[PDB]
Amino acid sequence: IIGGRESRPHSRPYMAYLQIQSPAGQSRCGGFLVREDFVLTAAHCWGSNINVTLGAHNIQRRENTQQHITARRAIRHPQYNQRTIQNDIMLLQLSRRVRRNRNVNPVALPRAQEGLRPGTLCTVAGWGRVSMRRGTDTLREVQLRVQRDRQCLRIFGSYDPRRQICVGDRRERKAAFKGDSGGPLLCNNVAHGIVSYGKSSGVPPEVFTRVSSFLPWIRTTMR
Amino acid sequence: STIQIPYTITVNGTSQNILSSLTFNKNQNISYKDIENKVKSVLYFNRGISDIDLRLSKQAEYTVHFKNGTKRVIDLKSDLINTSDIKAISVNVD
Numbered sequence: 460i461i462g463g464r465e466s467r468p469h470s471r472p473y474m475a476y477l478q479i480q481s482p483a484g485q486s487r488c489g490g491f492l493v494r495e496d497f498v499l500t501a502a503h504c505w506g507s508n509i510n511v512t513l514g515a516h517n518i519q520r521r522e523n524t525q526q527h528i529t530a531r532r533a534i535r536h537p538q539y540n541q542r543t544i545q546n547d548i549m550l551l552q553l554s555r556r557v558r559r560n561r562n563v564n565p566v567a568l569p570r571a572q573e574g575l576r577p578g579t580l581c582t583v584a585g586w587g588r589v590s591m592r593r594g595t596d597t598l599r600e601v602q603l604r605v606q607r608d609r610q611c612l613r614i615f616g617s618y619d620p621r622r623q624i625c626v627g628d629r630r631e632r633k634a635a636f637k638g639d640s641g642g643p644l645l646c647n648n649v650a651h652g653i654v655s656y657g658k659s660s661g662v663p664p665e666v667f668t669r670v671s672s673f674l675p676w677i678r679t680t681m682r
Numbered sequence: 683s684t685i686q687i688p689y690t691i692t693v694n695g696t697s698q699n700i701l702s703s704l705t706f707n708k709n710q711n712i713s714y715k716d717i718e719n720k721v722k723s724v725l726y727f728n729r730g731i732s733d734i735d736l737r738l739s740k741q742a743e744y745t746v747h748f749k750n751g752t753k754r755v756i757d758l759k760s761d762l763i764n765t766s767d768i769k770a771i772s773v774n775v776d
């Protein structure tokens with residue numbers, strides 16, 4: 460998270476932290492709980508072996524609120540395109556259901572292709588880098604504004620406003636960054652977006668996957 | 683006995699917001715071929731790009747950033763290093 464602040468601890472109890480095995484090394488993403496047995500995240504966070512941590516604030520400490528659960532299945536969208544980062548959405552079925560409590564519980568999803576105003580105020584959170592030189596141990600968050608599509612259309616040759624959201628005012632140094640992939644974009648306490656990609660500099664706008672475009676796939680996959 | 687070296691990948695101007703690392707052994711002298719095989723490995727895993735795609739692309743390179751603040755840019759279309767000097771790696775394909 461660039462330009463944000465540390466979250467109040469456990470104020471976002473749907474947040475998931477993902478540790479991913481990726482030859483030849485490791486990857487870290489965010490994600491969010493959408494049902495006691497399912498985490499939603501980005502398809503490019505896929506790996507043969509994924510550990511999920513719920514209930515975390517300081518992910519470098521083994522906190523007494525954390526629940527550690529492996530992913531049983533990691534279900535990418537069937538039309539995920541790695542090269543263009545299109546249809547970038549994945550469901551993790553957890554190997555057991557979370558213990559639901561105040562610090563661990565799911566976030567609501569929107570209704571069938573519910574829209575989102577350019578100018579809507581949304582919040583993104585995660586454990587990603589805060590700059591090109593510094594990271595964070597604790598959950599951070601920042602408020603961002605949905606952009607007109609034209610802003611992403613002219614810099615991202617594969618941005619598709621039917622499936623993706625253009626987020627972030629280019630005049631502000633506020634952005635999700637490396638490590639925040641898969642985390643939710645929350646607007647009015649509903650997860651409308653999934654952090655997906657941007658420029659390597661972290662300068663906005665950046666592209667989120669539009670959750671409402673995939674609701675029928677989400678519901679079929681979770682049943 | 684190993685370290686994680688962060689890497690970033692940009693393809694056609696887009697970069698996933700993942701935090702991704704390469705595993706290296708501590709304090710080892712490796713060559714640039716050693717790094718390239720790891721770069722091509724994560725390029726294929728993350729963005730589906732292998733050698734054929736680099737030859738069809740316009741320009742392709744990776745940059746090794748070093749802790750002393752220097753960098754070395756290496757062409758993917760056309761010395762030894764100690765792993766503990768490496769700060770990060772960036773890959774760019776057009």
Ligand SMILES: *[C@@H]1O[C@H](CO)[C@@H](O)[C@H](O)[C@H]1NC(C)=O
Nearest residue numbers: 478479480481508509510529
């Ligand atoms: C997940 O945790 C198990 C047990 O702690 C460990 O053996 C495994 O390597 C972990 N996987 C990843 C991808 O970190």
